[PDB]
Amino acid sequence: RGSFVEMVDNLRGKSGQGYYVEMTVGSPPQTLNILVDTGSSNFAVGAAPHPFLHRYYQRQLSSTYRDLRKGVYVPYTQGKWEGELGTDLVSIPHGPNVTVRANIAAITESDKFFINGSNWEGILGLAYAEIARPDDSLEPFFDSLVKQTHVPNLFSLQLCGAGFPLNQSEVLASVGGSMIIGGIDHSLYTGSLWYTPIRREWYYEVIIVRVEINGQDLKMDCKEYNYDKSIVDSGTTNLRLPKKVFEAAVKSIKAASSTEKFPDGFWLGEQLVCWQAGTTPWNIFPVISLYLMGEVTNQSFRITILPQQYLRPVEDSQDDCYKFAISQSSTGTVMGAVIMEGFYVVFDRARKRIGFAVSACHVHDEFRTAAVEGPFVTLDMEDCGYNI
């Protein structure tokens, strides 16, 4: 049974541009579309005109706006923003029926942060205070929400990839998924939920203990899989792997799909590959299984994704085109949107654990499905975690 009907189907977007939820800030309420990001901890919104924004937060029009008289500069390689800190009343129209006083970073200047055509005007950082900017004294939105209300300390995400490209109008009209605040909606998944511990509360950090490509063990020291960390990040498009893991995984994926040769640019995630309408050879591409530390001692479980997850649909023609959505990282494993699209993901902050179940909206074919299975007997799993 599905017990959170008001929050089901409250997301829009896609893996390449991000998934967002509608929010309101200020008095009277100012509506904004907000990127759902489990990989950061700031609630930051556009608050000045920008060519790629059609709306922004107007603090002078909010009677409940409180100025914190403090600036914040947050530079990332993926985009940078400068903001002015303050507080205001915040609601999630298709969320719990509560109004919170929360910190807001009013973005006044930015460099390649807002993306042309994304439809979002801000970011909802759902990770922990440890990685909030300027420091951990700036309470993240979800912490304020739990402290001020009776909403349980848990949220769950069902990110829904369409399995095909969505044009400018389609992406605005389509349901991109669900963010259930304070609970688990049982209609969003099939089978059982399996839980992996949150290693440390900063990013949503996890431990990967084994990797298979079509059941074939990648056979690397498991520390390599979590070098220097492994995180679950709705604000990353790809499955990102540490350099050495990426090189071994791409070699194995190429060997499994060897009946068809792809250009170097395809494996670099830069070039698209196209096939005649309806003829994508899904079967030649292998499944990928990530084994995660279980809640019970010496116990693991696996999550299995299909090429329908790691081949991201892109428009070219009537051909079906894709980009390879597995890429190299120098900052550890990132289980991005293309992985999350296969699963219903429960961020159980109260019990310091992350749940995975097969998503009711994952893209598959008649021959294979994504899977969440266990238990498996796995020894010295603590040794898989990286230190320093």
Ligand X SMILES: CC#Cc1cncc(-c2cc(Cl)c([C@]3(C)CS(=O)(=O)N(C)C(=N)N3)s2)c1
Active site residue 264: no
Question: Which residue reads 């431990």 in tokens?
Answer: 207
User: CA-to-CA distance for 118 and 225, rounded, in angstroms?
Assistant: 32
Task: Output the smallest distance, CB 82 to ligand X, in A.
Answer: 12
Shortest Cβ distance from residue 303 to ligand X (Å)?
18
As measured in angstroms, the least distance from the Cβ of 343 to ligand X is 14
Minimum CB–partner distance for residue 79 and ligand X (Å): 4
Token digits of residue 182 = 């304070």
Tokens of 61: 């029009």
Long-range contacts of 379-384 (CB under 8 A, 24+ apart): 379/298, 381/207, 381/209, 381/222, 381/293, 381/298, 381/300, 383/222, 383/223, 384/207, 384/208, 384/209, 384/222, 384/223, 384/225, 384/226, 384/293
Minimum CB–partner distance for residue 44 and ligand X (Å): 8
Nearer to ligand X, 75 or 263 (CB): 75
In angstroms, rounded to a whole number, what is the distance separating the alpha carbons of residues 256 and 287?
Answer: 10
Single out the catalytic residue among 88, 143, 185, 233: 233
Cβ at position 226, least distance to ligand X in Å: 17
Q: Report the residue number, 205 or 233, with the smaller CB distance to ligand X.
A: 233
Q: Which residue from 352, 342, 284, 305 is spatially nearest to 15, judged by alpha carbons?
A: 342
198 or 248: CB nearest ligand X: 198
Identify which of residues 18 and 140 has a Cβ nearer to ligand X in the complex.
Answer: 18
Nearer to ligand X, 167 or 298 (CB): 167
Distance CA 56, CA 59 (A): 9
- Rounded to a whole number of angstroms, the minimum distance from the CB of residue 113 to ligand X is 6
User: With b meaning 16 or more CB within 10 Å and e meaning fewer, what string describes 36-75?
Assistant: bbbbbbbbbbbbbebeebeebbebeebeebeeeeeebebe
Distance of CA 262 to the CA centre of its chain: 28
- With respect to ligand X, which residue has the nearer C-beta, 40 or 196? 40
Smaller CB separation from ligand X, 25 or 231? 231
364 phi/psi in degrees, rounded to 5: -150, -175
Collapsing DSSP to helix, strand or coil, 30 comes out as strand
Q: Tell me the DSSP string of 169-197.
A: HHHHHS--EEEEETS--GGGEEEEEEEEE
Query: Which tokens hold the place of 163?
Result: 């399995």
Could you confirm whether 135 is annotated as catalytic? no
Residues 6 or more apart whose CB falls under 8 angstroms from that of 311 comprise 280, 285, 322, 323, 324, 325
Tell me which residues touch ligand X (CB under 6 A): 15, 17-18, 37, 39-40, 76, 78-79, 113, 115, 123, 233, 235-237, 337
Residue 144 CB, nearest approach to ligand X (Å):
18
Q: Which is nearer to ligand X, 25 or 34 (CB)?
A: 34
Residue with tokens 């460099």, as numbered in its chain: 111
- The one catalytic residue among 37, 143, 185, 320: 37
- Residues involved in catalysis: 37, 233
